A paper describes a structure:
In the present study, we focused on one of these gene clusters, Cluster OS3 (consisting of four successive genes Os1348–1351 in the genome of Os17), which was predicted to be a bacteriocin gene cluster, and we constructed a deficient mutant of each gene. We found that the deficient mutant of Os1348, which encodes an 85-aa small protein, exhibited weaker antibiotic activity than wild-type Os17. The Os1348 protein was annotated as an alpha chain of nitrile hydratase. Based on the results of biological investigations, the full-length Os1348 protein may be a bacteriocin precursor and appears to be post-translationally modified into an active form by the products of downstream genes.
The full-length Os1348 protein was overexpressed in E. coli, purified, and crystallized. The Os1348 structure was elucidated by the molecular replacement method using the ideal helices mode at a resolution of 1.9 Å. The final model included four Os1348 molecules consisting of 2–79 residues in the asymmetric unit. The six C-terminal residues were not observed in the electron density map and appeared to be highly flexible. aValues for the highest resolution shell are given in parentheses.The Os1348 monomer was composed of six α helices (α1-α6) and formed a Magatama (comma)-shaped α-structure. Two Os1348 monomers joined and formed a dimeric structure. The Os1348 dimer had a semicircular shape. The dimer interface was composed of many hydrophobic amino acids from the α1, α4, α5, and α6 helices. Based on its three-dimensional structure, the free energy values ΔGint and ΔGdiss of the Os1348 dimer were calculated by the PISA website as −20.4 and 17.0 kcal/mol, respectively, suggesting that the Os1348 protein formed a stable homodimer in solution. Although the Os1348 protein was annotated as an alpha chain of nitrile hydratase, no structural similarities to the nitrile hydratases registered in the PDB were observed.
Author numbering:
A (entry chain B): 2 to 78
B (entry chain A): 2 to 79
The structure:
C-alpha cells in the first residue's frame, strides 16, 4: 500500500513498545530506525510514528519490557 | 522459542497500540485475541500482555491511532 503497510508498522511500533532503546532511536530518526530492522515507512507513517510521545510509551511499556526481558535471556527452543 | 517469539509478540502489541478495539479484546482475552490474528502466545507472553494498562496504552497510542486511521481509509497501491 502507498501510505499504510499496517503489519510492517505494527512490527515497528510493537518493537518500540517492547524496547526502550529502539523506541528512542525510532523517535529521533524514524525512517532510518525502521530501515535498520528492514521496514520502509511512508512519509505518512513517519509523521504518525513521530506522534508517539516517548514518556507515554515508556509509561505503557515499562511493565511488559521488564517481564519479556527476564524471559528472553535464557529462553529455549 | 518457548517463552518469547519477539516478532509475533511485536505484531500483537503493535496492533494493540494502533487499534483501541483490538487492545481491549487482547486485555480481556489475550490468548484468544492473539489466535484470532494467527499468533500463539506462550503463558509467559500472556502474563506480559496482561501487564499493559489499557488507559496507559490509549494515552500513548491516541495520536498515532487517529493519524493512521485517516490515512488507511482511501490508501492506494504504489
Amino acid at each position: 500500500s502507498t501510505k499504510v503497510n499496517q503489519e510492517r508498522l505494527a512490527s515497528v511500533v510493537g518493537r518500540a513498545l517492547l524496547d526502550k532503546d529502539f523506541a528512542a532511536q525510532l523517535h529521533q530518526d524514524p525512517e532510518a530506525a525502521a530501515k535498520g530492522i528492514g521496514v520502509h515507512l511512508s512519509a505518512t507513517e513517519v509523521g504518525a510514528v513521530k506522534s508517539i510521545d516517548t514518556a507515554k510509551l515508556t509509561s505503557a511499556g515499562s511493565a511488559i519490557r521488564d517481564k519479556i526481558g527476564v524471559a528472553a535471556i535464557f529462553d529455549t527452543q
